[PDB]
Write a structure and sequence with these properties.
part of a larger assembly; 4 chains; A mainly alpha (49); B mainly alpha (54); C mainly alpha (60); D mainly alpha (63); C: 60 residues; mainly alpha; 3 helices; D: mainly alpha; 35% helix; 0% strand; membrane protein; mitochondria; ATP synthase
Chain lengths: 49, 54, 60, 63
């Protein structure tokens, strides 16, 4: 889940800016990214290639 | 978790929030730099006015 | 305390109702800590400060 | 301590209004930034029946 989270983050927000934020907002964005990845709206909600 | 009020981590920490101390240092430097100029100007004005009238 | 709770034992309605206002205490205990460090927008705080003085939109 | 330190550091460099006071410059700048209406003076002391019990009323004067 970390891999997908940080992929989403670096695509959407950036790793440096993410590092600059607080641990709380870091966790908030991480949870949003985890939800975006678990959902997989683009894969038709399917964790397959 | 209970004392922070956050389930993930602390808040108002980070370079976005830590940099404000250095920003205050720079702002205070600028403020004193301008205040010394203003005080010198006002002191020259007063030293002129008093010794002209008083 | 034993006297008070020995009388609580004898009640009929208060001993099962007057405790239902107590979770609200923990609600405040939690929300206060949530608010002690809540991150907010500087622009909205400067434009719409809550109960700040000398706001002409309030009247003073 | 983190919150109040950040708040004080922003109050010093005039990025944030002082504690308990609504500052004009910061509010006008925030309104310009957010594209919102500026904080006006919507009150009307000369409205009918507002300062009738006022011993020291305010006089109308077109400036």
């Amino acid at each position: 889940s970390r891999e997908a989270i940080f992929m989403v983050i670096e695509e959407r927000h950036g790793w440096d800016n993410f590092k600059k934020l607080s641990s709380h907002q870091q966790g908030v964005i991480m949870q949003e990214a985890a939800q975006e990845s678990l959902l997989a709206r683009n894969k038709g909600e399917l964790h397959l290639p | 978790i209970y004392g922070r009020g956050s389930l993930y981590g602390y808040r108002f920490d980070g370079e976005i929030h830590r940099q404000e101390a250095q920003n205050v240092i720079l702002y205070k430097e600028k403020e004193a730099q301008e205040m010394a100029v203003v005080m010198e100007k006002l002191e020259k004005e007063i030293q002129e006015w008093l010794k002209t009238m008083e | 305390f034993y006297n008070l709770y020995n009388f609580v034992r004898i009640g009929r309605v208060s001993k099962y109702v007057c405790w239902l206002s107590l979770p609200l205490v923990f609600q405040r205990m939690w929300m206060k800590n949530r608010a002690t460090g809540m991150e907010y927008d500087i622009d909205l705080e400067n434009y719409a400060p809550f109960e700040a003085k000398k706001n002409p939109m309030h009247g003073h | 301590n983190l919150r109040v330190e950040w708040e004080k550091n922003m109050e010093i460099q005039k990025k944030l209004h002082p504690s308990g006071l609504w500052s004009e410059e910061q509010a006008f700048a925030a309104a310009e930034k957010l594209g919102r209406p500026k904080a006006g003076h919507p009150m009307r002391v000369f409205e009918d029946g507002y300062q009738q019990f006022d011993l020291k009323p305010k006089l109308f004067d077109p400036d």
